[PDB]
Symmetry: D2
Subunit: 293 residues, 4 copies
């Protein structure tokens, strides 16, 4: 029932025709489980949910539950701009046995804060008992929540956690101060160590798919007062992030996983383009060093 | 086909269960045709495309085509974040008989300019001959194109127009200067007259659904050098936009159309909430006012 | 006491050592008068006020008054971040015989709206009779005033105008609608024609120093309903602005004025760098073109 | 000279008439020295530099050097928008015996990166031996430097440190990784512990004026691997910052200093207004808590 921890934001493998690569998805789930990951955040931004249809997202949720249910925590990101579509995914997540649901603040169209609250309330209702993880990512959603609005969201009945994908660590601390028991996930992998120090008690990130144990290592180092190890691991994580940002994050991660024999075809769906070939050697070298870890 | 003109960005009527209200959609299409609108821009932001499934968007495109094909120009907004989804809609638009397609710059995920270009190229291919209207809306999409990038997109083979939903009239003038023959649509209704003066030769807007004749009137007034009338009309349009922004634009427009006996249920899809009851009297009064401007 | 019109935002010529070039400042004032400009806005952003000391700004105000008092309208930009500094400039503007004062919304530090109001009130007190022109330039000040805050500012006792350096023409129209008698200056030269159509009744601009007659031409053309001429003139002004933005605006303007035999040394003060020599051909040609335009 | 450490961004006390309160400036310098602060950053944003004249800024630099030279490290913020003005202050900092100079990226006018670089080179020359602390504060300056540009700046001859007033701790870490020996100051007090963890090796902040020993405590706790104590201290600091942001930061700090009998009059210069009276009891209580914390 404890949602605290390090949860990888699962990527969605696609085959040559851009259809779901089921075999690769199953391999990826098993791969994450073997890294000692606490759970999987499925169908989020990282899973390329916004370039998938509802039935495609459901298929991914169903398959992941099959592979991981009862082995690790499973959080289903069911967010869509539409409340109705989000509720359908929420209902499916409950049906498949997920531990919790999550929804990004609905975007593109401007919605009032009250409309955002009602959107979450409606999804929580359809989640039929699964706790909700509010997902705040201003840089992508364009939705800028105030601390006060955040306080209201995380106290909504049915909400059990906040995925804070914001680099504002003053706000991270304020949220922790206001909610001592809240499950608070750091969302920007590149500041994970600093985010934990500011108050997060876990994290959800796309890079956990290829080096989740490093983040688990940061949590442990900070708990043990081993600052140096925490800083060294974060630095190694950031060297990797530097590269992934240059290559394109999702495509870069899938390419590394391809060289790790997990993903058959490392492509993202259009309009994402392929990785620039000039980066393949660094991505292959990265996969090699990670495998030897 | 000449795509220049004042085209309403068609709203999509829904009922209490949030299902498409087909009868109201048909009534709204006819209402727009009766206003003397030059055409309709279907399934765009205004049509609440982003809270609809591909099948729902296709049903709307087909019904509008059935109702208006050959009577007015029809532009199908087929844009999705996904290129494949956008291509499917593009193929359907071609099948249904649309005159053109349009696609908002893909959003949420950051894409390089080259990826945007390939996205439009791919859609143009699926549009199988239907010209493409590039849709620029920085305020909503978050995609900030430079004049140079816009120049490249507008010159892509198969692109016949640009829907410029930007309040930057310096850029509007620059685009016109660089592309004298480009069909250039003013996207922000609230600066329509100034947009035409800067270089736009038409426009696409949501408020055209309820007062398209005022915008056609601005076009004509400027064509005759009657600046006073053009300003008078823009001011009235803005008095209305002031209200719609307070009430919520789409829901406010649907509510006005409901009072005009066009739309049965003025609801937008969740998460959009209903119009605050305190605004109904002003919206009803607006409906009455507008109905009188038509004689 | 009529402040409506086309006013050039005066540049401040400097000598090789970056000290004020008085002879060139006097020649530039005379050049602007000779163009038929309605007035001068002195010591504003364009005058490089923010890279000048209080005493240097006062010296410029004093010299411009000597040259032009009574011949054209004179607006003294006395805005500083500090209220006391602004008040000293305001008091000097009064002493020198200026017609009005102006102040950019205090920047760098974030101030509350009530603090901005008290700032203007204090300057107004020190202007002792000279009306205040509120200066709104969000792109530079970082101060994003709301429509309602703007309404409170332009209704402060002693405020006689608003310099609206914003490209939001919906807001321009809203301001005109709320204040029909307000002197409202369009601040972005590149959208001058569109800003007048939206409701501005004049403008203050840096490019007026080299082609003021074109903007006066736009005003006249719109007043006569000749839209083609207004657009053609705005297009010509924008071709120039395209160039100036590439070259750096103040330095490009000073360079054109150097080739018109007005400004001895066309440099701006550090950290502004000199104009890239690759642009000198176009700037030289522009100066020739402009001189030919007046016969 | 070792510039690493916790340096208070010194406030500038003003008297009842808003002139510099020299006596209080001296006592505040001594108060800071007494809490074990590593140094003082003088005449910065926090010092209300931008509402002071050059002579007033020099006067403050001179007085602070008189009180503290040789006792703690002294960094003179000499930054102005003008390069020449910055150079004059830099020469003064040198004459007064400061250990380093610093300059905020010139603001208001947009300058190219090359111009920013030349601005720093010129000040470095005038500083005559005093190392330069590049001051990056995007939220105030409006200047958005890329990591690559930051690298160029910190490697300019004469640059000895970077005052990173940015909440982006990914960039903080990238800077440390690219420059292992660089003196890197965390500029946002509210993320100090996290900033140190990301790679900063010290900090410059306004709240150090009233509770600098707490920040020194965070430095010490992290060095000893005592995470809990570091977090507890940061939390206490943030409770204070929460209040200061509500009260207005500089005025709030000055008021606490007034209650601690350090500053005679807690006024900021206009346009900053006074502290809202409803907050005085909380500020006085804070002053009492902080005084009780010193034994």
């Amino acid at each position: 029932t404890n949602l605290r921890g390090v949860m990888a934001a699962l990527l969605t493998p696609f085959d040559q025709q851009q259809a779901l690569d089921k075999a690769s998805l199953r391999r990826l789930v098993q791969f994450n489980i073997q890294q000692g990951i606490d759970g999987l955040y499925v169908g989020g931004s990282t899973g390329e949910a916004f370039v998938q249809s509802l039935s495609e997202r459901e298929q991914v949720l169903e398959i992941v539950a099959e592979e991981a249910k009862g082995k690790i925590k499973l959080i289903a990101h069911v967010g869509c701009v539409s409340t109705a579509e989000s509720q359908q995914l929420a209902a499916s997540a409950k049906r498949y046995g997920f531990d919790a649901v999550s929804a990004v603040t609905p975007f593109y169209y401007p919605f009032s804060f009250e409309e955002h609250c009602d959107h979450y309330r409606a999804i929580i209702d359809s989640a039929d008992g699964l706790p909700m993880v509010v997902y705040n990512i201003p840089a992508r959603s364009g939705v800028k929540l105030t601390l006060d609005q955040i306080n209201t969201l995380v106290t909504l009945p049915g909400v059990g956690a906040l995925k804070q994908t914001s680099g504002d660590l003053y706000q991270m601390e304020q949220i922790r101060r206001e909610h001592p028991d809240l499950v608070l996930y750091n969302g920007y992998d590149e500041i994970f160590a600093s985010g934990l120090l500011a108050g997060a008690d876990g994290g959800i990130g796309s890079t956990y798919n290829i080096m989740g144990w490093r983040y688990q290592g940061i949590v442990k180092a900070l708990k043990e007062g081993d600052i140096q190890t925490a800083q060294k691991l974060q630095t190694e994580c950031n060297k990797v992030i530097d590269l992934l940002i240059k290559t394109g994050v999702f495509r870069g991660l899938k390419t590394v996983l391809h060289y790790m024999d997990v993903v058959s075809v490392p492509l993202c769906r259009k309009p994402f383009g392929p990785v620039d070939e000039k980066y393949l050697p660094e991505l292959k070298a990265l996969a090699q060093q990670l495998m030897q870890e």
